[PDB]
Amino acid sequence: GQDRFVYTCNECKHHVETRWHCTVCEDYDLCINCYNTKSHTHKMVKWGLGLD
Ligand SMILES: [Zn+2]
Ligand SMILES: [Zn+2]
Q: N6-acetyllysine modification sites?
């Protein structure tokens, strides 16, 4: 999910201002903490606006 400065963590299914985003999955996302632990190993991108 995305907005011009908002995003989601598809692991929290809550909003984030900075996400890791799977370009494999259908616009799947992870906040920093989830990316750091949930070990999503796929071809991603990152969009960030506050806590990169
Ligand atoms: Zn993925
Ligand atoms: Zn998360």
A: 43, 46
